[PDB]
Every structure is written in C-alpha cells, then in structure tokens.
Design a binder for this molecule. Sequence first.
Ligand SMILES: [Fe+3]
Length: 839
Amino acid sequence: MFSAGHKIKGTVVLMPKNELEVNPDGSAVDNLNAFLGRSVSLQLISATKADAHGKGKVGKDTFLEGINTSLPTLGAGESAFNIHFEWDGSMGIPGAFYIKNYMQVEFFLKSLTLEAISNQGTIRFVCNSWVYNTKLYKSVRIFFANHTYVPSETPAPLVSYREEELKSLRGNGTGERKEYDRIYDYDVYNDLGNPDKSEKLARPVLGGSSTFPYPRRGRTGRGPTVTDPNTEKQGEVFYVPRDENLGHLKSKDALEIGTKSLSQIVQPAFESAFDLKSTPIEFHSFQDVHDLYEGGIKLPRDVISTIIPLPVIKELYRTDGQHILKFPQPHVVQVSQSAWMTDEEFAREMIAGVNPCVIRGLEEFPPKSNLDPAIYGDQSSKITADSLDLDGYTMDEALGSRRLFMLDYHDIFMPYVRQINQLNSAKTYATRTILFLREDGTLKPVAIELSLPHSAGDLSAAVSQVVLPAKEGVESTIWLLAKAYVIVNDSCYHQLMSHWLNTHAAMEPFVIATHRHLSVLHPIYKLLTPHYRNNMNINALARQSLINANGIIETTFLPSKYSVEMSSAVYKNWVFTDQALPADLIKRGVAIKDPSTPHGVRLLIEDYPYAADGLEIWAAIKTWVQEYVPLYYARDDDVKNDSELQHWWKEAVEKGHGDLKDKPWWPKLQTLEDLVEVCLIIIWIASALHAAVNFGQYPYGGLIMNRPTASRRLLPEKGTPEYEEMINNHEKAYLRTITSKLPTLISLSVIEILSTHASDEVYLGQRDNPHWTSDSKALQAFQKFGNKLKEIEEKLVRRNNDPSLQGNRLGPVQLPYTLLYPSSEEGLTFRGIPNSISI
Ligand SMILES: [Fe+3]
C-alpha cells in the first residue's frame, strides 16, 4: 500500500559469472535464488529533485525480489529479476542508480528497466558492466539512464555525480592495477623487454623520447624490473580496465587468448618435434608447403595431444586426433595454386591485397632517395629508363600520363639493413619496385632494385643490383627471388606499420582519453565507444605475447629484435590528418583533388579496389557523423565551450600521442568542422582501415610463398653451388631464401586466428544495444547509416560481378575483392567490417 511512498516496478537483467567465462571448475553456480534475499541492492537517484547540496536525492536500499520469467526476448545466459522501489512523485524522476553486490562472486549487469507508467512511460539503463563484491570498491558503482547530454545540458542534480565518476575513472596515476579496477591512464611501451630473464631480452623503451617516439598504452603499474628501473616487471596477466575485457558465451569466440596459447604452449611443442627430428627441418619443394592444407603435416602424438584440446587453437587445424594437423586451404590458392607466381598477381596485390596502401605515383625518373650518401654510399638509382618495357611508351610519356608507380621501401629499410643483416639467418635488401599502369587498366611490375648500404671497411662483398622481369632460365629464378625480397619488405611493413602501428597502437590513446574525459552521457562518447570494442584487451595481450621480446613477431619476422623499434622510427612521420582516406590517396600520388567528383578526388588507377570501395565506406561514415554532430552542437562556439570535449582532445594529443604534440597538423577542436573531422578519422581507422589490412592475412598469406615473412640469405654469386641450385632446383632455392618451416607453422597459426571473425562481433552499422540512447533523432540517423551500408554492399557485389573489372578485382587467383563488404557471418570469411580493432 502507498503511504507517501509509491512503487516503481523495475526489472534487472544480469549474467552470473559462470556464463561469460565457463570451464568445468568454474561453474560455482549457486543458481538464481542466491541472488535474492539481501544479496544485491540498488538505489534510485533523482535527476530532477536535489538535496541541500545540489546532488540528486537517493532512495532506499532495495533488494532483488524474485526471478522474472515473462518475456522470451532474453537470451545470452541472462536472467531477469523483479524489484520494486519506494519512490514518491516528490522524489522527482530517476536518472541514475547505485548498486551493491553483497555476494562473494561478481556478476555481469546488463540493464535496469523502470516501467514507471507516468511520464515517459519507460526509463532505460544500459549497463553492460561487471559488479564485483561491494567491499572491493572505493566508491559505489553508479549507472545512468540512457539520456544523452553535453556538459551544459546535464540536469543540475546529476552534475556532481557526472564529474565524480570521471574522476574515479582517471585514478591518480599510481598503484598496481587490479582485475576489478576501472582505471584508465597512460604509460610508455617499457613492458616488452624481459631484462630480468636475460640481457639479450632487454629492449629500448618506446615512447617518451626523441630517439624513440611512440603512442602511449594503458597503464598497468606492475613496477620496475630488478635489473632495470625503466622497464616494467613481468606479470601473468596484463591488466585492462575491467569492462574492456568482456567475456564470450562461446569459448571459441575468445580469439584474443590464442596468441598466448600459441606462444607459450603450441610453439614449444612444435620446437620439440623439430629438435627430435621427427619431421624434416626444411620444406624441400613447393608441394611440401601445399601439403599443409591438403593431406596435412604428420607430427608426434604428444604434440597433437598438446594442441588438440586447447580452446581457439583447436579450431585452427583439422586432425585425426593422433598424428595429423591440416590447415584450411587459403583463399589465394582456391582456384589456381600457381597464380600467386604471376607478375600480374604480384602487382595486383599492391592495390587489392593484404597491404593495399603503400604504392605511390612516380612523377620523376630515376627515383630519388633522401638518405645520407655519407653513411650509406651513393644513393642514386641504378635502374635505367631504357631497360624498361612500358608497352611502347617512352619514359616521358609514362610519367606525363601518370602511368608510373612504385612500391618504395628503399628509404624505409636502408637505415636497418646493416644491423638486420648482422643477424644469423636474416639477410634483406632495401627494395624499390617500379610499376606501370597498362592501357588495359592493370598494373605490371617492370623492375626491382635490391639495395644494400655501403660503408668503408664493409666485410661483405655483396652489392646492390637491379633485376628485370624474365620468364625463362636462371633469370626467371632471379626475378622470382627479387619479388620475394620485395614481399618480405612488404610483409614486415604491413605487420608492423600498416597494421600494428596505424591501427592497434594509434587508436589506444583515443580509447583512454575518451573514458578519462567524456562521460558515458556524452554524445561523442556514445558516437565513438562502439569503435573501441576489445581494442585495449587485444593490445594488452599483444604486448604480452605478440610484440614482446622473443614473442611471436620477433621469432617469425625478418627484423627479429629490431621489429618494434622500426615502427617507432616510422611513427616519427605518422600524421593524424593523413589517415583520412582522401588525404592518404592524394599524399601517395594515387589520386588528385577534383571538386567536380562525388568524393572530391579523382583516382589515377580507376579500378584500384581498396581505394574505390574504401571511398564508398568513407562517404557513408562522413554522412553519419555529419548528421549526428548537429543534433548536439548547433554552432562552433558550442564545440569550443564543451569542457569535456576540450579536455579530451587536449589529453589525447598532449599525453596520448604526446611525443608528436609539437606538430603543426593537429586539428583544433574549436569548430563543428573540426569535430566531424576528428570523429570521422577515428571511426575510419577503427573500422574500415583495420578491416582492409587485417582480414586478408590468412586468405593471402596462408601460402608462405605468396607472403614470406623473412629472407635468410642474399642473391648467390655466379660460381657458387647456391647459384647452381637456382638453375637446377629453383623451388629449393626459393624455400631456402624465405621463412623456414618451423617459423612458418607458427606464423600461419597466428594469421589464421587474426583473420577469423568471432560470432559475437558487432559490425559497422550495428550497436550492441538498440537503446544506446533515448534520442529518437540519433536513432533515426543510425538507421539511415545502416541502410546505406547495405546499399553500398549491393554496389560492391555488382563491381565484383562486372567482367570488365576482373583484372584488378579478381586477378589470376580469381579471388573477388570482398574485404570492404560491410557484413559477414562468423569465420575466416575475407569480408566484413567490424566497428573496432577487435582482433
Ligand atoms: Fe588487427
């Protein structure tokens, strides 16, 4: 009965821990009824009625009453609970709530729904957050209703709560971070080396210096190593704010745990098989490589037994359960097993492959170098115009008609060649490949320059050289090897720069800044956060097993211990505004500004799959951001006066990407134009850019010959048995040059995991909850965005089905370019654009 205290009917949906992360000895059930009694209490907070302090009034401690089992639309191992609050109309309208978990074990709170049949009828709270036992928290967990507000629009009673929650999220910059902590802060990459285990595992700190600038990462606070105070000590779990590590109902969907298992468990098992000489140490012919996805590879019983039961890992190979591991057939060989060897495919993959964003237009000949000849010797190119086959065109005609392009790794790799070549089993060249756009619209490679630095007293007699296309004799073998050296350069740049640096590492500082300065009520927070899903989690796991000293990348890629620092050298030239698709195309000389076109740019290679499909996605995102922003910012002054926004941007730049705060190109955030730009670029990088460079890894690189990760020797001298091998056994010559069999098994496994779409992925044009905001306007705009993406996909399908575009969109491998199709089912699909860098 009501006595100046009326009742509000509410429903709590939560997931018991044994749902998102289960294992036999991890189901401490204590079913539904244990959540009753005095186990969980919530308190409504008023958004309209305030106390003597200006803070909204707080209701009574209310405990769950019972298990609600009414609506079908409730899945994912979720449970609904009935609860009633004593909230008289005088208490105003609830806009938030406190929650205390008195149980020992934490649970995952999905939402609260107040069916307050009066005003708006229904008040919704989308929580999606783990609630640990109350004794573990310094302050009570607070959640807000799904309303959106810029700081100036926050209801007065909620103003203090909004700011306190942000202060809580920031922490104070000290202390070892714990599992239940939700503290976002920055730190340099000083956690990769392992000096305490060995001086050989000591690595330079990346970030915080002019020698090694680098984006910041999430602070973990484990403390100094015993031997080095600048290096953070080892830890079995690399912390990420609690909700950044949400589980999966299905174990097979926890793809990010794969790298740890592969490095620590699978790799040592593979190694033993080789140490015991139970399998040939090297591939002896191309068929030995093809065998991996056909009949498979035979390994010792206990190596199969070590692999076969592991979650995620067991999904990577088919097995007989005793001796065979069989990898899935890579997309690149599904129609033709030899097409990867063609010059047509080599050039096509530069515009439609795994790394379609490095090629540049060449407007002068010969190509020039900006490196010091005093250090590296004469840097003039040795490629002669007269030696090239440009389909009848003269050099001047090719240059003027904008038909000359290049894949230039000369200046990028030259500074590292000497030190990489001093390593055992690592030999590389700083390569440059010249390409010509034929009249038929396809690209053809016309020359490759294999350069080596030359200094006084060089012990090595190896010299630089230019290799030209050849289809027969030893010359054809030399040209095939030349393409291999180029792809090793490309694979390394792709893995470390196009992929790791530009997406994973560049985005983390924005994730941290967003949680530290934009409240969950903020429209820009709601706009950006979906594009951060799993990013910090995958990054922390990467720092621990992928990019760490002796981790997966160092043990499978050419640069070895120099891998990650090379990406710091490249970061010196990373420009935020150049990450925008149009600016990138223009900067690389593959497109020119053209106001008369729909996208504002004219492509110099009209059928450049990545760029043409990408511009369509870029346009759809821009339209969405341009429609969303106005809903909350009427004029430029509103942007300038948003305190959270200014704080967020100031920190993202001066702290997150602090080593480059001194650059002239950082956008200011004083106008509506600036805001749309920064958000558009962030969303682009997290979704489409990452998808384009990530999901083709196994599809193209699943055949080691197509995408070698390392080279082990330079070209042989004419009078040596190695030279004789090129003439007599070119397959063996090729295999001895590229990645060895053991590291191949490990790298194929990693890229297989990274190219897989978890079944619980949230794609571009999707949100994890249909009530992310109460604002119907923002909800309409998002609907248009999704409809437009479906429209774009129909168009890309037509492009792939158009025979006149077969040369660049399909190639001799007959693999339709689907990497930029917005949607996809689960698996290794070669399509689908996730909202974020989630793997
Ligand atoms: Fe990735």
